[PDB]
Amino acid sequence: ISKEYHIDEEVGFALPNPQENLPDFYNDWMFIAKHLPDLIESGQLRERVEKLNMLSIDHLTDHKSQRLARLVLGCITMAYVWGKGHGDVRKVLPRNIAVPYCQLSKKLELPPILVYADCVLANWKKKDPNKPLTYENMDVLFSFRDGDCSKGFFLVSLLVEIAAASAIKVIPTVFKAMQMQERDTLLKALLEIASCLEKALQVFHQIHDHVNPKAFFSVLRIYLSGWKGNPQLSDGLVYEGFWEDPKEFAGGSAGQSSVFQCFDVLLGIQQTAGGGHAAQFLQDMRRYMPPAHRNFLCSLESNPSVREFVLSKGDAGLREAYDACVKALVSLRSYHLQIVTKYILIPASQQPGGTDLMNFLKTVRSTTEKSLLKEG
Ligand SMILES: O=C(NCc1ccc2c(c1)CCCN2C(=O)c1cccc(Cl)c1)c1ccc(Cl)cc1
C-alpha cells in the first residue's frame, strides 16, 4: 500500500506509537486534559479553561505532536461544553481555546470536534515497548470521568482496528490478481481476508470484560455527544474568534471508522448508493476521517469491481471465497447489534437515539446479507 494513505503494516488505520507528551510550552493544556475527572467533580474545569492564555500552534511541528494536541483540545472541549453531564451546558467556546483548536483542525483537515480518529486511533500507548499489543500491556492517554469505562471502550475498539490490519494489507494482492488474470492467487487472497475478519470478531468479545452497561449509558455516552440535530444545542457551537456564527458537527461514532466501510467498498456492497439515510450518513462520516484515509476509500471505488469479476467467471470456488468474506461482515454487524442491545437499549428502558442506531445497523446488515451470491 502507498505511504500517502497512512496505513501501517502492524496497526492499520491506527496511528503507530502516538506521542504521549507535548512540548513544555503547552503545559497548561496538558494539566487540564490529564485531570478532567477531578476538575469536573470539583466544579473548577470551566474556571481553569477561561483563565488560559491563547497559545500559538506554530511549535507543533510534526504530525504526531499535532494529532496529540487535537486529542487534548478535543477532550477539553467536550468537558467544557457538557460539564458534570446533567443539563448545565456552555454554548460558547472561549477564544483562547477555540482559536488554536480551529487553526490546528484546519491544518490537519478535520472538523473541530472530538472524532473516532482522536479518541481511539491516537488515544493509546504501550507500557513496555518490548512486549506485544495486548490489553494488559496497553493504556489510553485520556479519560473523562472516574468509572466511565473509557479505557475498555476505546482500547477494545483499537484492538479490533489492529486485527483488521491483517486483512487491509491483502487488498493490493486482490486487485493485482484481477488485472493479471490470476485465479488461484485471487482465491487465496479472499480466503486470507475472510480468516482475518473472523479473528476480528473474536477480538471484539473482550468488550464485556472491560465495559459496564450503566457506566457507558449514563456517563461516557454523554461526553461523546455532538451538536448536530441536538435540542440542547439547537443552533450548534460558537467558536469564539474564528467563526462569527455557530456551527454544527456530529458526535463520535463507529461510522467514522475506516474499517467500518472499507471492506464493504472492496467487496462492492452498495452501502453509499440510492440516497437513503444510512447511505447518506456513511458518506458524511468520510469528512470526519483523516484526509489520507478518506482518499484511500474513494481510490478503492476507482478500481474495477471485485463482485462483477467474481460473477462473470462461473467458478464455484471463487464464489465460496467471496461469500466467506461477506458472511464474516454479516457476523460483525450482528455482534454489533448485540452490543447495542446490552449497552444502550436495556439501560434506556429501565430509567423513568438508541432505536435509530439499531435501525441503521439493521439496514447495513440487510444490505450485506443480500450481497451473498449463495444463501448462508
Ligand atoms: O462504537 C464504537 N465502538 C464499538 C465498535 C463497533 C463496531 C466497530 C468498531 C468498534 C471498530 C472497527 C469497526 N467496527 C466493526 O464492527 C467492523 C465493521 C467491519 C469490519 C470490521 Cl473488522 C469491524 C465507538 C463509538 C464512538 C466512538 Cl467515539 C468510539 C467508538
UniProtKB/Swiss-Prot annotation:
Function, in words: Catalyzes the first and rate limiting step of the catabolism of the essential amino acid tryptophan along the kynurenine pathway. Involved in the peripheral immune tolerance, contributing to maintain homeostasis by preventing autoimmunity or immunopathology that would result from uncontrolled and overreacting immune responses. Tryptophan shortage inhibits T lymphocytes division and accumulation of tryptophan catabolites induces T-cell apoptosis and differentiation of regulatory T-cells. Acts as a suppressor of anti-tumor immunity.
Tissue expression: Expressed in mature dendritic cells located in lymphoid organs (including lymph nodes, spleen, tonsils, Peyers's patches, the gut lamina propria, and the thymic medulla), in some epithelial cells of the female genital tract, as well as in endothelial cells of term placenta and in lung parenchyma. Weakly or not expressed in most normal tissues, but mostly inducible in most tissues. Expressed in more than 50% of tumors, either by tumoral, stromal, or endothelial cells (expression in tumor is associated with a worse clinical outcome). Not overexpressed in tumor-draining lymph nodes.
Enzyme Commission number, as recorded: 1.13.11.52
Organism taxonomic ancestry: Eukaryota, Metazoa, Chordata, Craniata, Vertebrata
Residues annotated to bind heme b: 336
Compartments where located: Cytoplasm, Cytosol
GO annotations of cellular component type: cytoplasm; cytosol; smooth muscle contractile fiber; stereocilium bundle
UniProt induction comment: By IFNG/IFN-gamma in most cells. Exogenous inflammatory stimuli induce the expression of IDO1 in antigen-presenting cells such as dendritic cells, macrophages and B-cells.
GO biological process: 'de novo' NAD biosynthetic process from L-tryptophan; female pregnancy; inflammatory response; kynurenic acid biosynthetic process; L-tryptophan catabolic process; L-tryptophan catabolic process to kynurenine; multicellular organismal response to stress; negative regulation of interleukin-10 production
Keywords, alphabetical: Cytoplasm, Dioxygenase, Heme, Immunity, Iron, Metal-binding, Oxidoreductase, Tryptophan catabolism
Disulphide bridges, residue numbers: none
Pathway info: Amino-acid degradation; L-tryptophan degradation via kynurenine pathway; L-kynurenine from L-tryptophan: step 1/2
GO molecular function: electron transfer activity; heme binding; indoleamine 2,3-dioxygenase activity; metal ion binding; tryptophan 2,3-dioxygenase activity
Miscellaneous remark of the record: IDO1 is the target for therapy in a range of clinical settings, including cancer, chronic infections, autoimmune and allergic syndromes, and transplantation.
Protein's name in the database: Indoleamine 2,3-dioxygenase 1
Subunit (UniProt): Monomer.
Keyword Cytoplasm listed: yes
Record note on cofactor: Binds 1 heme group per subunit. In the active form, the heme iron is in its ferrous state Fe(+2). The catalytic cycle does not alter the oxidation state of the heme, but IDO1 is prone to autoxidation.
Top-level taxonomic group: Eukaryota
A Pfam entry, by short name: IDO
Enzyme class: oxidoreductase
Keyword Transport applies: no
PROSITE patterns with a match to the protein in the record: IDO_1 (PS00876), IDO_2 (PS00877)
Catalytic activity, reaction form: D-tryptophan + O2 = N-formyl-D-kynurenine; L-tryptophan + O2 = N-formyl-L-kynurenine
Family annotation (SUPFAM superfamilies): Indolic compounds 2,3-dioxygenase-like
Activity regulation behaviour: Activity is inhibited by and MTH-trp (methylthiohydantoin-DL-tryptophan), modestly inhibited by L-1MT (1-methyl-L-tryptophan) but not D-1MT (1-methyl-D-tryptophan).
Similarity-based family: Belongs to the indoleamine 2,3-dioxygenase family.
